[PDB]
Structure 1
Amino acid sequence: DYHLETERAQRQIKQKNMVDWIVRNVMKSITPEQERLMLSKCISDLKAMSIKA
């Protein structure tokens, strides 16, 4: 039970800091060229929904 609790605690801590680092890196992952590409893709999706009337 001690080994199970130790491994589960380490797994939970690893998951928590991985999630926080992923959030921070995603907030650091935005580039203006990719922002323009995502805006163009959103406009294309909105136009595709406009076709589906």
Structure 2
Amino acid sequence: DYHLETERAQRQIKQKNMVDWIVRNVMKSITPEQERLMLSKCISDLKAMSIKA
């Protein structure tokens, strides 16, 4: 039970640490060329939903 709770405590802090690391890394990594590509994909997906009727 001690090893299980130690593993659970280490798993919980690693999950919390990787969550805030991913949030900070995703927010700090914003590029305009990828933003325009995602904008074009959103327009194409909107056009695909209009066709799907």
TM-score, L = length of structure 2: 0.90
1:16, distance to aligned residue in structure 2 (A)? 0.5
Identity level (%): 100
Unmatched runs of 5 consecutive residues or more in structure 1: none
Give CA-to-partner distance per residue, 1:1-53, whole Å, 9 cap, x none.
Answer: 11111111001100110011001111112210000000000000101111123
Q: CA RMSD in A?
A: 0.9
State the distance in 1 between where 2:52 and 2:5 align.
53
Structure 1 segments (4+ residues) deviating >4 Å:
none
Residue 48 (structure 1) aligned with residue 45 (structure 2): no
Residue of structure 2 equivalent to 1:13: 13
State the distance in 2 between where 1:44 and 1:35 align.
14
State the distance in 1 between where 2:24 and 2:3 align.
32
